[PDB]
Amino acid sequence: VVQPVAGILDVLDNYAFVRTSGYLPGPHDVYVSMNMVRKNGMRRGDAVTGAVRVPQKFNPLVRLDSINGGSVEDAKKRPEFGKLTPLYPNQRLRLETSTERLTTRVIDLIMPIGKGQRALIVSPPKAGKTTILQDIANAITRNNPECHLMVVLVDERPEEVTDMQRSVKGEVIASTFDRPPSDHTSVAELAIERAKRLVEQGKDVVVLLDSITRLGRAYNNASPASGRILSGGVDSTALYPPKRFLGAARNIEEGGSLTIIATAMVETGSTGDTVIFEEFKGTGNAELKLDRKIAERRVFPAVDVNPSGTRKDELLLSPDEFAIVHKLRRVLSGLDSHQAIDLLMSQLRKTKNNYEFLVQVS
Amino acid sequence: VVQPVAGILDVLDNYAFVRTSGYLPGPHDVYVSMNMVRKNGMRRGDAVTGAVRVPKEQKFNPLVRLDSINGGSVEDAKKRPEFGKLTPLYPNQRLRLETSTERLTTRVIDLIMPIGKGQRALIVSPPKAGKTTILQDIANAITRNNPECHLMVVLVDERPEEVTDMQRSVKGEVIASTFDRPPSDHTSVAELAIERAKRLVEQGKDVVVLLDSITRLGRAYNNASPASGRILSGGVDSTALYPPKRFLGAARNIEEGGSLTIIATAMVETGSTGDTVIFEEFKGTGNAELKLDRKIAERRVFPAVDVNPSGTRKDELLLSPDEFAIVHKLRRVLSGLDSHQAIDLLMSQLRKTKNNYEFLVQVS
Ligand SMILES: Nc1ncnc2c1ncn2[C@@H]1O[C@H](COP(=O)(O)OP(=O)(O)OP(=O)(O)O)[C@@H](O)[C@H]1O
């Protein structure tokens, strides 16, 4: 009957819905009773292909066809929760693809991204964030196509969702600003559950969430006041769910990983953004800081070299590469940011991200 | 028998009335059942022409026949919904506003904030800054220069005299609900107006909505219902900020054809915390903003725009590359100076009988 694949979502109550075409609650969704969920071993993020009875207000979804990876009898799935989470610098996500315009060799020498990492890009508005995210998505899709890239735009203009869909080869999930914050939270939750299920399958997943601050604000505005409402306009109980999202980024010793590259808003003129970013300090191992005052000088990507780095770099780079990168970082920390970024780009102009290593050692 | 003509409003329940007022719940509105809506392919905002029975008996007499929908046919209702259609960045085609040498309101707007078919504008203005004259000038320029665009002017809380003033000074549709009406009426008027704009865009036509005081719509939404979301926002409920965002975000271009411009106005420095909170919550949503400054208006210099924080986002697709370079140079020059000096210099140089003739002067 009605075949289209869609990510199933089990709402916290007894209701479970198949979000047709994904991921927002649509007007032609299909109802799933937990009887069928339990007799089928259904998770919270599977992609079903069942049929309906064409004439719970919605369809009954009788005669399920398939699940995301296997079938009904595939009830042997390793949970994300009760599972081992190694250090996750093991495998390296290469980002160098071209030399004419870099925008990624800098954030490759400065913030080595690895599979299963939990990155965080700090950026003031109008500093070069969307270009960086698009270039990261393109580099991830081209360098290693095995990664199941997906992009989550929690709160964006409808004009920008189309641009992202056209400039990114991966899957794009987005909720426009003209949606209730409940839709924002539901989309983020369903996206992270889909990523978790793909990890349990054994595939390296990359999630390029945009504006974790907007996700935190959506969680804040969705619910009324709660414990410790006095923090700057946001209650402390509303900063748990976003962390949970950012807490999903982990490696797996058996196989697979979940990389999350979220973006944080600072200097936005709202105290809530600064508060949310401050209470997120100490969770992301790799942090990249974009500086506004460097962007107005029309030099890009305009990263803050000194406060940007990666935790546990020993397991990502090769020992000789690690030594060279350490020497470069020491040299950059010797200088101030406004000159260090200029020197780094000046050296990177004439090289190909390896000749510079050859030049640096000399 | 009687032949009402009205724009249908489809309420959440099974009721559906045609608003032959229009757009305001009147004393006599023809009732339409859901069965008629489904059979005739009706949807909220459609312009409906049909017949109705004589008084027979249900306070409102149900509709009986239908002659036309939105000017078309009952069977020709195969138009695509707006939600499912692709929404480009909408700088593709710009609406020229400079129409005469004498008036410098539209010339300044064209130089500072270019407007294209599909923008989502926001005029930020304190009280007594020159907002109504600017809206009237924009409406006149749009009607004169772009007659193909269907012009709608929505007023949410206005004096009953100002509605007539606008109706006499504006040629397009003027929908208004005066302050002597419940906030539910302002809500219904705004929602029905935007749904009508959507239904016209689905036909491929260009619609331009001139909303007045999006803050008034936000306050009407806030007062219409008891607080249920995060009340701690500055006196205004957090749930009350969603429907105004929906109204403002309905302004999308269409790749298949059409556009829906929304030049809304936001009120700041009104002495109320609700207005400032709503405006702050509406940050980063509109891609064209014009800031009117009270202190510039007090100097009796108009249109009194605050140039530096006002501009269009992604105007590269609106302007030709040489014109874009010239405008970028002008914006750099203006940003070199403070607000008062910038507007004074712009007004002083704008008296060169055209905008293009100033651009030619700008090169040399
Ligand atoms: N790699 C790059 N090379 C050159 N210019 C760039 C680069 N990345 C961004 N820019 C500049 O940045 C602008 C494009 O917008 P940008 O990517 O900065 O938006 P953003 O950071 O998403 O901003 P916002 O918060 O408004 O959405 C242009 O001025 C463009 O020249």
Ligand SMILES: Nc1ncnc2c1ncn2[C@@H]1O[C@H](COP(=O)(O)OP(=O)(O)OP(=O)(O)O)[C@@H](O)[C@H]1O
């Ligand atoms: N283009 C213009 N040229 C000259 N004077 C102008 C112009 N536009 C507005 N004004 C002046 O503005 C006044 C007209 O009212 P105005 O447009 O300022 O009201 P408003 O912004 O709607 O105010 P309110 O907040 O009371 O509704 C007059 O003093 C008129 O001279």
Ligand SMILES: [Mg+2]
């Ligand atoms: Mg952006």
Ligand SMILES: [Mg+2]
């Ligand atoms: Mg006025």
